[PDB]
């Protein structure tokens, strides 16, 4: 049982039937050619070794023919011939069965090897050229924050051109496997238990909704099956599906497991455009990256648009200093001594609120959600010190020991 | 007979290393400073640094260089160990430096390594451990076996790396390209170097008293002459273990090809039969037509538009659709070549307005399906 599949099977089938060809022939030659031939009564011989003749036979059959080792007796000469003619035929045969047995290769086998420290997470679902795009920009975009994690599809059948070449264009970061998370196999070969998440994509223009949602839901429960603590995002396309979700055993958004709808967002931008114009766009720039690079053509509207896209989200926790004030303080902190915006508290029992009423306190090492250029501006919040360093002009050394 | 002496340094080199990582493992097995070094020579080998990638470009270039050195020794002609005292000599102790800075590199990497076992049986650990002990055998006993030193070349595999980096390449079609021709120039070069070997040192069954003294020209045309099968016998081998590589050659190489066969055929097939841009000639006018060209809907045109007579003016017309025009508009199209023009492309894509030069059109027809199955979407 050393082999296994009908392509092994054929192939040593083949291999052997070809030495066994190649072998037998030589010795045939061997004999015909030493002991010369009756016509000129064995005087005619040719005493070649028998590897003289099994090289002749390779230089011949290859077509080669280098003319060094060339047969002299009538039977000889016959011989090879008909060897000619026999190999040719036999060869011509089996052209075909060589093209299948070698052209039933997979392209994207095998299987992901961890590198250590090394993070990374697991992409499946409706894997295509343009939904693997807008998801790529900016998960793989230029600036990230300074962090790097290797990016990991699987997916059943091949990427298609124009994906092959957005994956050789990036091929250091990520990698392309044939398979699906329907097979514990698959989950095993792609490492699930040592990636840190996976993200489900599903086909925002599909012609029935309900079985688009109905396969990513299934996926979702295969994953969970396979490892209960594994982090999951999921897309799905209406609403009411995400109802299904909840029933999962082992799904907890608390814990920190999540579905983004398309339907609730992409209507839900456009609803809150019509409540004050515009702002469906400083809600998706607030929330995507992008890459601000003034230069001096740009109109002056331009460039003040640019910094303003600029603006990403971020989240830290505050300072002590911040203790027992009311909310509109510490925004009057934030904004004029620290030059951050913040928007919302993480508040205990956890709960997020928005712009509280002046009745709050900001406690003791709640979360705070901040718009700034990058997280390195924002760690300001978690150190400043209205003892120590409320008297500091330049922000740029707000982070110290006084305390 | 003084070339064991050489290959001894390799075979030694080799074993000793091995031996120590199998100790090292065994002994782990049956029982931090270099933590910073790890990750910095990972880096370094990543070409992420600038130092790094700069490093990777000279290692390679550096590379070809020693070739060179190894072509001017095989330049030399006479046997495959030959030589004259060192002292002041020629240019040797050029390659002695290239030798060590690539033993400084394979440290780095046995550094980088990860799992030492995989990292000592790597296809350039064997060309290292080849090419780097035999040159100081050389210096040290003042004599030169012109041995492996050849195997460096495989090297130029590296290029479609180096073109990526410099981002030259840029389609897939190219990578790939670049990949095959580099992987083939790789395998004659070297494959030429181990035939020269053997038939100029004779083998060990006739004491090394059969050789053949061809020049590694000739074994580099040689091997063209077979592997492209015509294989005129001009140049034929001798050696038992030359007669005897020569037939592996002849296998791996139909075998490696008939593996490329699908591959060549498919970069080849890729090729667009309708591309390029239209070339304003100055006071030759032309106008552009897109939409729903076939062989009719052309035909009933094309008749008016190019009739025998046009009240005696000649414009050029110029169609562009996406997808191949089909045989009859091909023959249509070829029957009238020096007035018509056919690209692949649409008028959807700015670029191909730019490539058909709609600026200098002084208009455009835009035609339609008379039979659409529903004119609102056609329209």
């Not at chain 1, 016509?39 to 005619?44: A, I, M, P, Q």
């Not at chain 1, 990698?175 to 097979?183: L, R």
């Not at chain 1, 299934?218 to 099956?225: A, G």
């Not at chain 1, 396979?226 to 909840?246: E, P, R, T, W």
Request: hydrophobic share 45%; aromatic share 14%; charged share 20%.
């Amino acid at each position: 049982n050393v082999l296994k599949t009908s392509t092994l099977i054929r192939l040593v089938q083949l291999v052997v039937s070809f030495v066994s060809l190649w072998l037998t022939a030589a010795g045939f030659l061997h004999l015909l050619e030493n002991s010369g031939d009756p016509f000129f009564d064995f005087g005619n011989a040719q005493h070649l070794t028998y590897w003289e003749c099994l090289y002749f036979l390779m230089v011949t059959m290859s077509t080669v023919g280098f003319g060094d080792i060339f047969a002299t007796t009538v039977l000889g000469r016959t011989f090879v011939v008909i060897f000619i003619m026999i190999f040719i035929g036999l060869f011509a045969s089996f052209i075909p069965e060589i093209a299948e047995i070698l052209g039933k290769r997979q392209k994207y086998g095998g299987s992901y090897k961890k590198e250590r420290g090394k993070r990374h997470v697991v992409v499946c679902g409706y894997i295509t050229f343009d939904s693997v795009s807008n998801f790529l920009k900016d998960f793989l975009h230029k600036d990230r924050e300074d962090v790097d994690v290797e990016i990991v599809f699987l997916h059943k059948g091949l990427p298609g051109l124009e994906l092959e070449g957005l994956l050789k264009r990036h091929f250091t970061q990520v990698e392309y496997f044939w398979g699906s998370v329907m097979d514990a196999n698959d989950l095993e070969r792609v490492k699930i238990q040592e990636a840190d998440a996976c993200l489900v994509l599903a086909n925002k223009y599909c012609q029935d909704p309900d079985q688009e949602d109905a396969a990513n839901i299934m996926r979702v429960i295969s994953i969970k099956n396979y490892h209960s603590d594994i982090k999951v995002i999921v897309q799905l396309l209406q609403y009411h599906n995400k109802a299904y979700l909840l029933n999962i055993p082992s799904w907890d958004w608390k814990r920190g497991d999540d579905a983004v709808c398309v339907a609730e967002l992409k209507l839900g931008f456009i609803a809150q455009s019509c409540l004050a114009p515009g702002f469906s766009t400083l809600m998706a720039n607030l929330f995507t990256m992008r890459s601000y690079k003034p230069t001096p053509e740009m109109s002056q509207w331009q460039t003040d648009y640019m910094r303003g896209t600029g603006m990403e989200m971020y989240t830290e926790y505050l300072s002590s200093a911040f203790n027992a004030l009311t909310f509109p303080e510490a925004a009057e902190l934030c904004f004029s001594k620290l030059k951050l915006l913040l928007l919302a508290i993480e508040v205990r029992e956890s709960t997020l609120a928005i712009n509280p009423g002046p009745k709050v306190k900001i406690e003791n090492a709640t979360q705070g959600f901040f718009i700034a250029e990058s997280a390195e501006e924002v760690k300001r919040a978690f150190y400043y010190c209205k003892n120590c360093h409320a008297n500091v002009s330049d922000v740029r050394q707000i982070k110290k020991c006084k305390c | 007979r003084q070339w064991y002496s050489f290959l001894a340094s390799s075979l030694v080199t080799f074993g000793s290393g091995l031996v120590v990582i199998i100790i090292y493992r065994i002994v782990l097995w049956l029982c931090g400073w270099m933590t910073e070094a790890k990750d910095w020579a990972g880096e370094l080998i990543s070409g992420q640094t600038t130092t790094g990638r700069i490093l990777v470009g000279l290692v390679f270039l550096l590379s070809i260089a020693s070739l060179i050195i190894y072509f001017i020794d095989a330049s030399t002609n006479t046997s495959v160990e030959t030589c004259l005292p060192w002292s002041s000599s020629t240019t040797q102790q050029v390659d002695l430096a290239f030798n060590v800075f690539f033993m400084i590199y394979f440290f780095i990497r046995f550094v980088a390594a990860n799992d030492k076992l995989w990292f000592w049986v790597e296809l350039f650990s064997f060309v290292d451990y080849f090419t780097i002990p035999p040159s100081f055998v050389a210096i040290y006993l003042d004599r030169n076996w012109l041995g492996l030193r050849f195997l460096r070349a495989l090297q130029l595999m590296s290029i479609p790396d180096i073109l990526t980096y410099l981002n030259v390449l840029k389609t897939s079609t190219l990578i790939r390209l670049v990949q095959l021709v580099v992987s083939f120039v790789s395998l004659w070069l070297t494959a030429a170097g181990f035939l020269h070997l053997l038939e100029n040192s004779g083998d060990p069954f006739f004491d090394f008293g059969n050789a053949q003294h061809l020049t590694y020209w000739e074994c580099l045309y040689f091997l063209m002459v077979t592997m492209s099968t015509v294989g005129f016998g001009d140049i034929f081998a001798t050696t038992v273990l030359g007669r005897t590589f020569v037939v592996i050659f002849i296998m791996i190489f139909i075998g490696l090809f008939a593996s490329f066969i699908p591959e060549i055929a498919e970069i080849l097939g890729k090729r667009q039969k309708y591309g390029g841009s239209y070339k304003k000639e100055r006071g030759k006018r032309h106008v552009v037509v897109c939409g729903y060209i076939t062989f009719d809907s052309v035909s009933n045109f094309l008749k008016d538009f190019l009739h025998k007579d046009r009240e005696d003016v000649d414009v050029e017309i110029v169609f562009l659709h996406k997808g191949l025009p089909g045989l009859e508009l091909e023959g249509l199209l070829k029957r009238h070549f020096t007035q018509v023009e056919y690209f692949w492309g649409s008028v959807m894509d700015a670029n191909d307005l730019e490539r058909v030069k709609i600026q200098e059109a002084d208009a455009c027809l835009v035609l339609a399906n008379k039979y659409c199955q529903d004119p609102d979407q056609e329209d």
